[PDB]
Amino acid sequence: FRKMAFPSGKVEGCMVQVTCGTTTLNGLWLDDVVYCPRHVICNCEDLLIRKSNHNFLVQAGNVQLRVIGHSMQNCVLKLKVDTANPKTPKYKFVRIQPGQTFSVLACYNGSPSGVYQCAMRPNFTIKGSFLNGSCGSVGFNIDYDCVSFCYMHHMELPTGVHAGTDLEGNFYGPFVDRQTAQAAGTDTTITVNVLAWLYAAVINGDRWFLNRFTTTLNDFNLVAMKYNYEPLTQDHVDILGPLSAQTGIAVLDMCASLKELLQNGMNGRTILGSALLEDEFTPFDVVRQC
Amino acid sequence: FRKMAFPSGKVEGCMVQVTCGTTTLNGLWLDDVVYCPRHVISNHNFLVQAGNVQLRVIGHSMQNCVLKLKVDTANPKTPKYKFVRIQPGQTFSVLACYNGSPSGVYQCAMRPNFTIKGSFLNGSCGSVGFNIDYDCVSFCYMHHMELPTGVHAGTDLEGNFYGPFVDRQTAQAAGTDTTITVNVLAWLYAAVINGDRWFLNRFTTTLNDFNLVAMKYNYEPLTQDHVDILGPLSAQTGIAVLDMCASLKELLQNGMNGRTILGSALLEDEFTPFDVVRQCS
Ligand SMILES: COc1cccc2[nH]c(C(=O)N[C@@H](CC(C)C)C(=O)N[C@@H](C[C@@H]3CCNC3=O)C(=O)COP(=O)(O)O)cc12
Ligand SMILES: COc1cccc2[nH]c(C(=O)N[C@@H](CC(C)C)C(=O)N[C@@H](C[C@@H]3CCNC3=O)C(=O)COP(=O)(O)O)cc12
């Protein structure tokens, strides 16, 4: 069982470099439009009216695309180009929910650099790996050749976690695209994902945390809230149904295991090679892989 | 620090499926040759497909445990590429594939016992591992087998197994594994780069003395090639390799003491010196 990203090729063929003045970052080229963070032009609406199409330099590899129009949508700039991208996959723009996962394609100067999986934290940050020049890198999921784009990268907080927008330019979380030190809300642990990962552990032969006890949902939620875990809902219990079906361990049975781990710790033991309780795998992530 | 795979697009363009009889696995289509595990078994006995499009086989040969199928079409998506044989401790990206269709990408490290900690199901054989340097893909792994302990084993692209395994339907055991010393050292350099340097001491060691101590803690001995690849990190931090070795020796002999390095009480041994520079630079 491994943290596994989607194959990134359908997205690599869409990455370009956008330059305006002395600022450069990455853009996403779909059909005849390039999407990139509006920070590349740095009130912002007045800054944009003062630019012309020729102020924007867009490169796909070494080929310069010609900008024939421009607009702003929240924190995202949309550059119309006179060339359509033939590598454009079937795609959608989606706004993901906290606790869901996606693949990030880290890019620099329009060149894809690395790929890895992230979860949208409850406090709407992501624990990524991004350096100077990564702005405009995107996050996505792939379902049957359709790429659903959900994240465009903008900033790194003082704590080292990351913040960005959806592809409509609206931030996840209470952040803004300005050069300021910004703190996130208090983070919490994605309970449904921890349980999905414990099921993944049982499917892979790790069973030392299982116990004889069962708990009620409300009693589990009282302990979970005490340890800064998100509440578990009946919908979460349902979503875990297939994993409980495959393992023969009722969901509220697994919750009793989680409660004991939270109250007694792991005593130096590991689960799937981890000394910590992992909450960045969704129930679907476990199913899709196992 | 994240375990980061290389972008997989250059390899995705090369994945095909190879069927002989009822057995289908993945193949790697470079120029006019398709490489796949020989376990898949005349030219017309082989069904090679890119998606649902058949590629006509015009020749075949066997190189160790890999089958080489000559096809009549040169792959237009062929990247600049090399076949390389990696050493234990080196990392690479795996593109997990089923029936010629890529499924996911993740980073693996070759253990000293020549296994990797993969995520592979039935139908994954022929999936490859690779590194990408300046648009050139160095292929280093082709997947063949899951051991009874859940770890995985395979060959290079010349069909030679890493480790003492064979492509038979038989339960095989790896040697007892050890910790990848060169990678732990890279991880300590990464901690120093980020300001976490409590573990630096004022001792040094010889390479040989360190190696003999290391083996008593189930750590790998260092080669001269290991000392060489730590050079860039040593210069960046101004900490000599043998001085860092002396620091690691104290951690082995004295423990963390409820202290952390880069947030964890466990030392990490699956980031190479190149991986550390990749992520810090
Ligand atoms: C006082 O200020 C601060 C204080 C404390 C913490 C702070 N953090 C940020 C920040 O993150 N600022 C954004 C720009 C604003 C306008 C949204 C930025 O720097 N984003 C990077 C990606 C970043 C770069 C390092 N790791 C990444 O993920 C781009 O890629 C674009 O900038 P570049 O042109 O490439 O350098 C400012 C700041
Ligand atoms: C009694 O014998 C055993 C006992 C105990 C443990 C054992 N392990 C193996 C083994 O590993 N067998 C090879 C085939 C040989 C010729 C190398 C295999 O590799 N199976 C998969 C990949 C595997 C399957 C699940 N996860 C993977 O990684 C392929 O992809 C090709 O086989 P398929 O045609 O796709 O099923 C045999 C065996």
Numbering used by the authors:
A (entry chain B): 3 to 44, 53 to 300
B (entry chain A): 3 to 43, 62 to 301
Please quote the paper that reports this structure.
The main protease (Mpro) of SARS-CoV-2 is a salient enzyme that plays a vital role in viral replication and serves as a fascinating therapeutic target. In the current study, we expressed six Mpro mutants (G15S, K90R, M49I, S46F, V186F, and Y54C) that have been identified in Omicron variants including the recently emerged XBB.1.16 subvariant and solved the crystal structures of PF-07304814 bound to Mpro mutants.
The occurrence rates for G15S, K90R, M49I, S46F, and V186F mutations among 15,476,050 sequenced SARS-CoV-2 Mpro genes in the Global Initiative on Sharing All Influenza Data (GISAID) (accessed on April 27, 2023) are 0.19%, 1.34%, 0.015%, 0.025%, and 0.016%, respectively, while only 13 reports are available regarding the occurrence of Y54C mutation. The prepared samples were successfully crystallized and the crystal structures of PF-07304814 in complex with these Mpro mutants were solved to 2.29-Å (G15S), 1.95-Å (S46F), 2.05-Å (M49I), 1.75-Å (Y54C), 1.97-Å (K90R), and 1.70-Å (V186F) resolution, respectively. Two of these mutations (G15S and K90R) are distal to the substrate binding site of SARS-CoV-2 Mpro, while the other four mutations (M49I, S46F, V186F, and Y54C) are located in or nearby the substrate binding site. However, the electron densities for mutant residues S46F and Y54C could only be traced in one protomer of the Mpro. Though four other substitutions, namely S46F, M49I, Y54C, and V186F, situated nearby the binding site of PF-07304814, no significant changes were found in the orientation of PF-07304814. The P2 NH forms a hydrogen-bonding interaction with the side chain of Gln189 in wild-type and mutant Mpros (except Y54C). In Mpro Y54C-PF-07304814 complex, the hydrogen bond between the Gln189 of mutant Mpro and the inhibitor can not be observed. The binding energy values between PF-07304814 and these Mpro mutants are − 8.9 (V186F), -7.4 (G15S), -7.4 (K90R), -6.8 (S46F), -6.6 (Y54C), and − 6.3 (M49I) kcal/mol. Specially, the binding between PF-07304814 and Y54C mutant is much higher than that between PF-07304814 and wild-type Mpro, which may be due to the lost of hydrogen bonding interaction between the Gln189 in Mpro Y54C and the ligand PF-07304814.
